From a paper:
To describe the conformational space of the T. brucei ATP synthase, we resolved ten distinct rotary substates, which were refined to 3.5–4.3 Å resolution. The three main states (1–3) result from three ~120° rotation steps of the rotor relatively to the static Fo. We identified five (1a–1e), four (2a–2d), and one classes of the respective main states. Throughout all the identified substeps of the rotational state 1 (classes 1a to 1e) the rotor turns by ~33°, which corresponds approximately to the advancement by one subunit-c of the c10-ring. While rotating along with the rotor, the F1 headpiece lags behind, advancing by only ~13°. In all classes F1 is in a similar conformation, corresponding to the catalytic dwell, observed previously also in the crystal structure of T. brucei F1-ATPase13. In accordance with the ~120° rotation of the central stalk, the conformations and nucleotide occupancy of the catalytic interfaces of the individual αβ dimers differ between the main states, showing ADP and ATP in the “loose” and “tight” closed conformations, respectively, and empty nucleotide binding site in the “open” conformation.
Mitochondrial ATP synthase consists of the soluble F1 and membrane-bound Fo subcomplexes and occurs in dimers that assemble into oligomers to induce the formation of inner-membrane folds, called cristae. Dissociation of ATP synthase dimers into monomers results in the loss of native cristae architecture and impairs mitochondrial function. Here, we report cryo-EM structures of the intact ATP synthase dimer from Trypanosoma brucei in ten different rotational states. Although overall dimer architecture varies among eukaryotes, we find that subunit-g together with subunit-e form an ancestral oligomerization motif, which is shared between the trypanosomal and mammalian lineages.
Residue numbers in the entry:
A (entry chain c): 29 to 57
B (entry chain p): 26 to 105
C (entry chain P1), D (entry chain O1), E (entry chain Q1), F (entry chain R1): 41 to 118
G (entry chain m): 16 to 144
H (entry chain q): 14 to 98
I (entry chain k): 20 to 62
J (entry chain i): 2 to 104
K (entry chain r): 1 to 62
Write the structure that this text describes.
Amino acid sequence: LEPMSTWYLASWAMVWYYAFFFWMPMVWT
Amino acid sequence: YNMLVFRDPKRRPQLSEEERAKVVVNQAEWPEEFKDFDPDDPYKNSPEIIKGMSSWNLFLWGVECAFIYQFYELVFPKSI
Amino acid sequence: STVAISVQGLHYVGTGLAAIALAGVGLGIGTIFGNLLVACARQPNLTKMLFNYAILGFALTEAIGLFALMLAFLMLFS
Amino acid sequence: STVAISVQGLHYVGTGLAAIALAGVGLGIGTIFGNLLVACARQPNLTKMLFNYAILGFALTEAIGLFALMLAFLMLFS
Amino acid sequence: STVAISVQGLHYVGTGLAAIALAGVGLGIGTIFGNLLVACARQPNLTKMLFNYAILGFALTEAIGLFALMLAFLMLFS
Amino acid sequence: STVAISVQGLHYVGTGLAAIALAGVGLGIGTIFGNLLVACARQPNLTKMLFNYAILGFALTEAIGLFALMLAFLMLFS
Amino acid sequence: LCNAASKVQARSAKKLAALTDAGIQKTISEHNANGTDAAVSSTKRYLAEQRQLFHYRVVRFFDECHYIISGEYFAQYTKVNLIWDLRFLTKLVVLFLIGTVLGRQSIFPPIDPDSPLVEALVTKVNPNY
Amino acid sequence: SNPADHFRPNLKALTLYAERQHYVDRWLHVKERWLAPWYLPWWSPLFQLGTWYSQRSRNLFLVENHLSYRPYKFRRNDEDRNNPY
Amino acid sequence: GELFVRPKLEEIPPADQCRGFFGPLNDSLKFLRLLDIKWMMNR
Amino acid sequence: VYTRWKCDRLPVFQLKLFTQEYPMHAAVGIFTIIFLWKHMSHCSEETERKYGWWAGYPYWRDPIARRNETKYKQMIINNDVDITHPKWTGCSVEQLEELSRVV
Amino acid sequence: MLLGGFVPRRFSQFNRDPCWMFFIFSVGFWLGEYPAMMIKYNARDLVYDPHRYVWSHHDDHH
Amino acid sequence: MFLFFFCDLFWLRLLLCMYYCVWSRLCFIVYFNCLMLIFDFLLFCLFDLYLFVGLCLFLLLWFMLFNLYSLILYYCITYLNLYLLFCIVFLLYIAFLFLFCFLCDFFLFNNLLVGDSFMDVFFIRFLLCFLECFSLLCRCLSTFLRLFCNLLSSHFLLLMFFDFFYFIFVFFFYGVFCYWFILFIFVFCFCLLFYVFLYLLDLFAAILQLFIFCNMILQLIMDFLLFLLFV
Amino acid sequence: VLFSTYRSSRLVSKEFLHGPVMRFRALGEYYFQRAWNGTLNWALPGEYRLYAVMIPFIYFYHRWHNDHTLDRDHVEKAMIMRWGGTLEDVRKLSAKDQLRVRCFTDIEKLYSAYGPKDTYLQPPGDTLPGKDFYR
Amino acid sequence: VGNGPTFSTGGECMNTCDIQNAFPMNDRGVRSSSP
Amino acid sequence: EIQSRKKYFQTLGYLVAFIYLYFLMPKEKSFSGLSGPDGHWIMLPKGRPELF
Amino acid sequence: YDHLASWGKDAFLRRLEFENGPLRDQVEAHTQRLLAERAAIAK
Ligand SMILES: CCCCCCCCCCCCCCCCCC(=O)OC[C@H](COP(=O)([O-])OCC(O)COP(=O)([O-])OC[C@@H](COC(=O)CCCCCCCCCCCCCCCCC)OC(=O)CCCCCCCCCCCCCCCCC)OC(=O)CCCCCCCCCCCCCCCCC
Ligand SMILES: CCCCCCCCCCCCCCCCCC(=O)OC[C@H](COP(=O)([O-])OCC(O)COP(=O)([O-])OC[C@@H](COC(=O)CCCCCCCCCCCCCCCCC)OC(=O)CCCCCCCCCCCCCCCCC)OC(=O)CCCCCCCCCCCCCCCCC
Ligand SMILES: CCCCCCCCCCCCCCCCCC(=O)OC[C@H](COP(=O)([O-])OCC(O)COP(=O)([O-])OC[C@@H](COC(=O)CCCCCCCCCCCCCCCCC)OC(=O)CCCCCCCCCCCCCCCCC)OC(=O)CCCCCCCCCCCCCCCCC
Ligand SMILES: CCCCCCCCCCCCCCCCCC(=O)OC[C@H](COP(=O)([O-])OCC(O)COP(=O)([O-])OC[C@@H](COC(=O)CCCCCCCCCCCCCCCCC)OC(=O)CCCCCCCCCCCCCCCCC)OC(=O)CCCCCCCCCCCCCCCCC
Ligand SMILES: CCCCCCCCCCCCCCCCCC(=O)OC[C@H](COP(=O)([O-])OCC[N+](C)(C)C)OC(=O)CCCCCCCCCCCCCCCCC
Ligand SMILES: CCCCCCCCCCCCCCCCCC(=O)OC[C@H](COP(=O)(O)OCCN)OC(=O)CCCCCCCCCCCCCCCCC
Ligand SMILES: CCCCCCCCCCCCCCCCCC(=O)OC[C@H](COP(=O)(O)OCCN)OC(=O)CCCCCCCCCCCCCCCCC
């Protein structure tokens, strides 16, 4: 299972961090 | 009525019975699209988007698309 | 002597055990609705409100059953 | 030493365990109906709204029993 | 004679047994909400206050299941 | 003949069995709060004292859960 | 076995009475009075009309061919005609595939003797099929 | 197994690899280049922010005296529990 | 939950009334208050 | 009238949002990003073979070996590395020539 | 939120709105792919791969 | 190791751009309780209790674009990883907790020491405080675990049932033409009923889990809010 | 001084691409800006036709991607491993043979866990090649 | 008359909303969708 | 006006991206090697003989 | 909203205009009478 994996966790979480720091302002405005 | 989970909205009456009874119905002024209007089938006389294109024709078109999608490789196979 | 053995079929046993957790969850859900019926007959004016709380309780109770079911899949698919 | 063993008949054991998950489901369903009778007897005019909620509770409880039953049949055929 | 054996599929059994603890947690939650539904119909004006206490029990009841769930992972992944 | 065997994987089973003890603790907590909700509706003027007693009961049950976890962790490691 | 038949007959009678088509009701009444079958009569009428319209179909085909070849059809081309042509192309493709399948009398292409798949033919569970 | 494989990202495009040593060294070069100019005195908060924490961490690493063995972070195979090398 | 108001200087009980693990650490035992954690908690 | 969301441009509003509206959340996110890239940014070759490929590692061509070969060739060529040095081989050049003549 | 919109009363009305026309086309595709699979994958001339026992996903994931 | 991938929202982003280039009212919210924290009038809070509204709305939008649309076959939940959800919940929960802690008001924690002065401090109250401090982190972990497990189990079940339905529909539909057609018809009707039931259950459960996910954070915030009365 | 922090500092004229933009807004507004199009947290609209149009399109493009990009990898692996272990060995076959193999793979996918196991388990006494055929 | 939209409602009924008073009521007793 | 223009351009960009992703972009690390990259190293040292 | 004039009205919009237009009272009366007749026939 990849959902329990960590060999590329950082790149995987970059999606959430991009959404939080770059897309949320656009949705906000 | 319903079509799967999609329910047809119904307009709430606004007139009372006394006022309603005094209303004179004249379908001559109504548009040809809505005559003998039926809440259970309001679009019976509604025009077709494309003349001669039936719903069954579109259903069969989709079925044919599926058959092509599944059978094209059988007739024109390609190598890896 | 040092002997290492790997039994494949054990994963079935663990999977079945997790399913037992659903016995409590299924029973727990029925308990909620039983109280709901016995409460709606004591104060029918709140039936809609009670039905809402019953559903919330069903999910929380159901959520636990999913935890066990996840383990069953993990071992059944490994 | 490295030894790999494959026990066949274990799938019967795991399947039986999942069947036990239906004990709570059957009990839970019976509890709902038992409560339904009391609610009807203490509020006889609500013989339909209570019946609907009893059916809803049974469906959810049946769903839990079916999740377990899927594993019971799946392991039996694995 | 001294013989050391390592059975490599036993962690499945322990994981399933720990998962069984979730039946009690699910049952307790259902009991809480069953009492909530039958208690609101008695004192509706305090419905909201009861709901807060009901969640508190869930917070203090779901946590126990986590420990059992935690052990499952510590043995399933080891 | 005298044969001594040392199975390395039997501590998982013991850990799982100990974790099952939490099903009673979880259910006991659910019972405590289920009665608490009923009692509060009956006599809401004593909500604080009942809440205090319920917390005391939860603590004692939690203490038992800690003992069970202590055995589980000991067997899991030792 | 009898109650179900009565229920089905009653439902069909209710639906038949429900329709508000003057021509259909008139034909039904006439056939019931005469004791004949309306559906069979309609089938025979349609077959007779088609038999009498065969050469009309031929003439229409030639007229349409002249209309298309003359370029007048493409002069007034619209999006609706594009939709119809796409439908036409789809039917042509599916018919071609079906024709090929029937022509070779097999869903899949036949296996050549030199292919390594011949073993599969040899190892058929039921040689009859 | 197959059902578990359905929970993977479906739009993977490219994967790039880089050694920790290489990019750490490049980062150190960039930091030195930007902190070298005279117009940034060593006592400035910016310079200390840049350097002090890294120095402290590296000193802690050097001072470490562990009785156990820590396997190399970037081995070829780290999936075998019975082979730290 | 509710607002907290610090007690007044006159509402604070004396140190001698506090109890330790075994008993109050009154005169001849005051210096033991530093080491008794339970006494500090009660205080 | 002036409003941050309507008057300021997107970058300015982003900075304002994450500095005077949700600064602590941004700090925590940066901390977590640093942790993830410091402790969860490595993948061994064995791990890649086990889980790193959609359908499985194609051992019949071993792309990992080709990748490492290209890496090492590029490093050697660019850095002018003498792979025949005794430290790399553990023996002198003359011993290497003797071995080559032997085998 | 399922509040309102055109709702055909029966099948024949699906041609009274372009969106429902596309919907019925999609439904036709969906339901007609199954008979196609029946015919294709239960064919008389369909043959199992002789080398099917050479390799399988079961040994790979194991 | 640096992997470049994309989320599965590009079409949904396009639709958002197309349909929200002009303003529209919002009246239905999954978690409405983030807007109405105070129910008794004349009560007010000096703490920024309404700071969580924007994050709540954005999280609801993101998780709804992912989870609800995942019921469509082959749609991918790109974020479905245990530790990624842990990171998200860590961010939110720890940020609010550090907001409360940076306030440097230690009295705010007086309620952690459960019970009254009657209870023994060392053997009862201190243990309860320990358990509650542990329970905060356990609540965070439970939130993220619940969110992960619900989706995972629901989609596993859907995949398995769909596989079974495909198998029986394709390889046993010929029974319609045979003498055992009734059994196949009964099985097919049961499968359709189960399909509908599963889809409805998943639709409801996704929204409910989002509601609970936001409610846990709001409960964390509320546990440390103090309301003053107007005079 | 270099760049403005205010959105009011325009970079283009008010009439730049007015017509295409109006057409795009007409497309957006006709079905969405209605009273019955009440969204749930901006994600679930109230117009039925929106569902009816978007669900099929999403499914279609997702399925095309999955079939032509994702499952293709599994199919190719099966063909390679079962017919030589190398791409050239597979290419040595004809298109019809590849079609047969891929359709057998589809059969295996359809059976999954609910079907006969002789498709991957070799019964004793079978004459077909084993796992060590190419080794 | 044209096909243009009007003041947005959000799919809400103004005769039962929490701000219903802000919407004028006509003779028939139906509150407006707009101010 | 500003938002209409911006969203028009964003819509065009997202349309192009969606087409490329779901119909043209190959998946990385293919078993056959016929489509997509297998990965490669970056930031390798250059012109630093003393490093070795 | 001149840019929308080219799109016209669909079936649902035409229905809404017909029901809630100046003829709304007549349509309401006709619909209610028809529904009452159908209900009476059902009973
Ligand atoms: C490998 C190669 C092998 C090759 C072999 C050889 C091939 C043939 C070579 C030539 C041989 C010589 C010629 C022989 C010709 C024979 C046919 C013929 O002439 O027909 C004319 C004849 C009428 O002629 P007529 O009497 O002169 O008509 C006077 C008027 O013209 C009447 O006009 P009209 O207005 O009435 O017109 C309509 C009429 C005329 O329409 C037609 O002409 C129809 C098509 C004619 C050709 C049919 C050929 C059939 C051959 C076998 C099947 C092949 C596929 C056919 C596909 C047809 C698609 C439409 O329609 C019908 O005939 C209707 C028939 C269907 C009735 C359906 C009722 C079902 C009720 C079920 C109730 C169950 C309740 C149970 C409750 C239990 C409770 C306990 O019609 C038929 O015989 C119809 C036969 C239909 C058989 C269908 C069988 C399907 C398979 C079984 C069912 C499986 C699925 C469903 C199961 C459900 C569970 C039970
Ligand atoms: C008075 C003068 C009158 C002049 C009249 C002239 C009339 C004739 C026309 C003139 C000629 C055209 C002028 C331009 C028109 C542009 C389009 C337009 O009209 O837009 C609407 C609008 C019109 O202006 P307005 O409405 O009058 O006023 C705007 C407001 O004042 C402020 O707007 P806002 O703040 O509200 O929003 C700005 C922006 C938010 O602000 C920004 O984004 C600006 C900052 C972005 C920075 C991004 C890069 C950062 C990189 C990291 C940092 C690097 C540091 C390096 C340091 C040094 C290292 C040594 O918003 C957005 O991001 C949303 C809009 C995005 C538009 C969509 C873009 C993609 C379209 C793709 C279409 C084609 C698809 C492919 C087709 C293929 C066919 C086969 O313009 C904008 O919104 C401007 C958008 C600018 C976006 C820039 C993105 C750049 C990305 C590529 C960077 C490449 C770097 C390469 C480096 C390589 C190194 C090796
Ligand atoms: C010219 C720039 C400035 C030069 C320097 C100036 C003077 C010094 C400044 C302050 C230095 C702080 C030193 C550390 C303080 C304490 C924190 C700590 O422990 O740090 C550990 C470590 C530093 O190592 P160290 O402690 O100095 O000692 C070395 C050890 O031996 C290493 O031991 P280790 O075990 O920790 O090593 C593991 C690894 C650990 O490395 C990491 O974990 C990396 C973490 C990166 C954190 C980034 C923070 C900002 C995030 C913003 C929000 C992003 C949302 C998600 C977006 C995703 C999609 C892009 O360490 C490294 O290799 C460090 C390399 C750091 C490279 C930083 C590159 C930043 C790129 C940002 C790209 C943003 C793209 C946005 C595109 C938007 C377009 C519309 O990492 C950091 O400090 C990370 C933050 C660095 C901030 C630098 C200043 C701001 C950024 C300037 C460059 C911007 C480039 C933009 C490119 C755009 C391309 C499109
Ligand atoms: C060596 C091979 C090459 C690769 C080198 C890479 C080097 C890496 C260095 C080391 C980095 C280490 C760390 C990596 C961590 C990665 C983590 C990660 O992936 O997380 C997943 C995560 C996924 O996030 P997500 O949720 O999918 O959303 C991100 C999306 O970008 C969508 O988010 P969004 O929509 O919210 O974004 C805002 C969006 C708002 O929406 C839009 O603006 C719409 C457009 C969206 C564009 C972006 C989507 C791209 C879609 C796929 C590609 C499209 C087709 C490309 C065709 C390529 C053909 C070969 O606006 C933009 O994107 C602004 C840019 C617009 C550009 C418009 C250009 C117009 C040009 C027109 C020219 C006309 C010329 C006419 C001449 C006429 C002459 C006569 O990725 C990120 O968050 C970003 C990671 C980026 C990390 C920094 C990487 C370094 C910068 C590399 C730049 C390379 C440029 C050179 C390439 C040359 C071709 C080969
Ligand atoms: C608020 C509640 C919303 C409820 C929505 C209810 C929708 C009811 C849909 C009825 C059935 C629709 C059938 C569509 C068929 C499409 C073609 C096809 O073949 O599909 C097969 C697919 C799968 O069917 P399958 O499993 O039989 O596929 C077989 C294919 N093989 C054999 C190859 C595996 O159909 C679906 O996946 C339909 C599931 C729909 C579930 C509901 C999703 C709701 C969430 C998304 C809403 C999006 C709205 C966006 C609006 C804009 C937002 C800004
Ligand atoms: C509610 C009801 C209505 C609902 C409608 C919904 C849409 C459904 C549309 C259905 C379309 C057709 C369905 C086709 C079913 C499968 C056809 C098929 O290929 O099966 C034949 C198959 C042949 O293969 P066999 O040799 O038996 O074994 C193969 C093992 N390798 O062997 C088998 O599979 C065994 C079949 C035995 C039973 C045969 C039953 C049919 C007998 C008459 C068929 C006549 C068809 C004539 C068509 C001529 C085509 C050229
Ligand atoms: C500060 C410079 C000092 C030295 C002199 C350099 C002169 C270089 C020659 C420039 C010739 C073209 C000038 C065209 C007009 C530029 C107007 C400008 O700068 O506007 C900024 C504009 C964004 O404007 P906005 O933020 O919306 O609001 C502006 C009002 N406050 O931004 C844009 O739209 C982008 C416009 C870019 C124009 C080119 C700028 C080049 C600058 C190069 C500087 C480096 C030195 C160059 C030396 C060259 C020698 C030959």
